[PDB]
Design an enzyme around this catalytic site. Structure first.
Site, short mmCIF file in Angstrom:
data_model
loop_
_atom_site.label_atom_id
_atom_site.label_comp_id
_atom_site.label_asym_id
_atom_site.label_seq_id
_atom_site.Cartn_x
_atom_site.Cartn_y
_atom_site.Cartn_z
N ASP A 141 59.96 -76.37 26.15
CA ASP A 141 59.82 -74.97 25.67
C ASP A 141 60.87 -74.71 24.56
OD1 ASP A 141 58.88 -72.30 25.47
OD2 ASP A 141 60.27 -71.63 26.93
N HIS A 213 47.41 -72.29 24.99
CA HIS A 213 48.56 -71.39 24.72
C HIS A 213 48.85 -71.34 23.21
CE1 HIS A 213 52.03 -69.00 25.37
NE2 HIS A 213 52.81 -69.90 24.98
#
Ligand code: HEM
Ligand code: HEM
Ligand SMILES: [Mg+2]
Ligand SMILES: [Mg+2]
Lengths: 298, 301
Positions: A141, A213
């Site tokens: 991330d 996403h």
């Protein structure tokens, strides 16, 4: 001019405190000045911690504190996807981040002493950087997060006018169901995120689902990317609740809202594929004024 | 033909830890393969994260250890009793998992592995994330660890059983304390110092004849004919600034006796006086466990 907690990169730990105002809004004025001075003292004492912190305010208390001037985009966080994304709008947000959790804890204690019984703490979350800067799903991330102070300022910090040095903040706690994630094949997880798991390589936009996403949040307007500065971290216990505490900073609230409208099905009726294993349970928008602005309150 | 201690007993100055306390839900058999898998996982994490300086311990409560050992050894092991008629509560569980290292993120992965190994065979009762605070101080503001056994040699002497079937093993005690820092801050610094038995800022010992008998040091610094009843503490602060916070107390000892004598002392069973720290903090859990040697965990089958 900018509050210290917005621009630092690669923090190892953070503390987020979300609270409501119980007392009079004038109590937030002295409290805020005390705290920003506390942060300056802690930075001087722990220079190795690379400590930063932000004090931000919800729409109703910020309108009072500012006398209606500026922060034109600020509003209470609405529900998105007609309730897929819940709303838990509070009055005050305190964001502490650094290389050392033990320093963050002392700073959080300082924050609580400064505001005292004027606030009602609704949420207190301890974020930690996991192995290889990965989310608990096992996907890295932060790869496409703006890098360096120059670009981060461009994306997150208001350039001029009354709000110069300020920033809009968005916070949303996610609860991961890793059992449900683990039921998915790695290729299926990869098509869900839009990047490979181990190697963290982008999957071509032409070759991944529109519900991926990346397809939901990598948005452009006539080729100009709607960028944000994320400060999200994993949180929780292995045996209890765990997930991602999502936190983003942007000179424009617009960029964040466009990504939420996309993820929660409001723009094209399609939802983020990550909702198959994780769900948002809190949501708030806050305004982070500049340091000069805070000094000018009382 | 000798024994190896589990890796989490002896390490010093670790900055972070995870403690998991759980009850057994099914056949005790489930604990045999799970425990072997878990210590194998620890070796794997030690290989992948050599700079984490990772250690872990798997320890068992009286009832399940009696079953796994066939009643041989662990002579002092028993369910944790109530001390002080309830001043020290008792929450005896079946399994303890203590992970400590220089890196919380590595501890988290290890904790996930522990849960995957044991799976639905256990019911997790407590999971506590400990963190070293500034200057190795307890959340009270007093340094914690000064007179703890120092160095591998002395720590082994105090914590590790030297011979017989339990050689390489250790007795463990865990007790979670909830601090009332508002109550503590109502106390003057001199009153706090008389409560602990050491000065707050400089951490100087106050002499035994200058401090009250209810002082923490007067309660736990015990000698039998001049020989100190030593223990190896691995306690750490835990909690949130705005929520529950305190000290997760954890101690290892070759003899449960040394621990029990300090508890009888603190909780008023010995001389009718109790530890002065009960003026601002209290214990809400309590258990005793047996940490076998690494090889005995490998003889689990
Ligand atoms: C469960 C919660 C979430 C998880 C696990 C998560 C995970 C990820 C991952 C793995 C990446 C790819 C690596 C990277 O570039 O950072 C990423 C990218 C990103 N995420 Fe999320 N995210 C979450 C929520 C959000 C939310 C709520 C927003 C926006 C409101 C958001 C906006 C972004 C953006 C803008 C990027 C960079 C996309 C690009 O330009 O390639 N994420 N996220
Ligand atoms: C609220 C929980 C507790 C706190 C805040 C606490 C704090 C302290 C402090 C500040 C010291 C002095 C510095 C040092 O030598 O480490 C200390 C020493 C010690 N504590 Fe505690 N302690 C706690 C519970 C316990 C319990 C439950 C035991 C035993 C069952 C224990 C046994 C000891 C021992 C043996 C020493 C060293 C005494 C000496 O030889 O001078 N402590 N503790
Ligand atoms: Mg892109
Ligand atoms: Mg002594």
């Amino acid at each position: 001019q900018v509050q210290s907690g917005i621009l630092p990169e690669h923090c190892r730990a953070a503390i987020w405190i979300e609270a409501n105002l119980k007392g009079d809004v004038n109590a937030l004025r002295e409290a805020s000045k005390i705290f920003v001075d506390n942060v300056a003292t802690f930075q001087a004492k722990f220079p190795d911690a690379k400590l930063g912190a932000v004090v931000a305010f919800g729409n109703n208390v910020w309108r009072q504190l500012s006398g209606g001037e500026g922060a034109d985009e600020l509003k209470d966080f609405p529900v998105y996807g007609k309730g897929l994304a819940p709303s838990t709008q509070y009055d005050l947000l305190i964001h502490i981040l650094s290389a050392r959790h033990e320093v963050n804890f002392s700073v959080a204690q300082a924050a609580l002493a400064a505001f005292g019984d004027a606030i009602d703490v609704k949420e207190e979350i301890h974020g930690f950087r996991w192995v290889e800067e990965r989310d608990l799903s096992g996907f890295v991330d932060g790869t496409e997060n703006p890098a360096g102070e120059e670009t981060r300022r461009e994306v997150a910090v208001i350039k001029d006018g009354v709000d110069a040095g300020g920033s809009y903040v968005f916070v949303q706690r996610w609860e991961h169901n890793l059992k449900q994630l683990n039921r998915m094949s790695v290729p299926d997880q990869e098509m869900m995120i839009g990047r490979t798991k181990d190697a963290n390589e982008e999957i071509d936009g032409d070759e991944r689902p529109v519900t991926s996403h990346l397809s939901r949040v990598d948005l452009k307007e006539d080729g100009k990317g709607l960028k944000i500065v994320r400060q999200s971290l994993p949180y929780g216990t292995a045996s209890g609740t765990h997930g991602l505490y999502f936190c983003a900073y942007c000179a424009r609230l617009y960029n964040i809202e466009q990504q939420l409208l996309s993820m929660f099905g409001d723009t094209d009726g399609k939802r983020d594929a990550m909702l198959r294993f994780t769900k948002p349970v809190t949501g708030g928008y806050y305004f982070a004024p500049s340091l000069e602005r805070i000094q000018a309150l009382g």
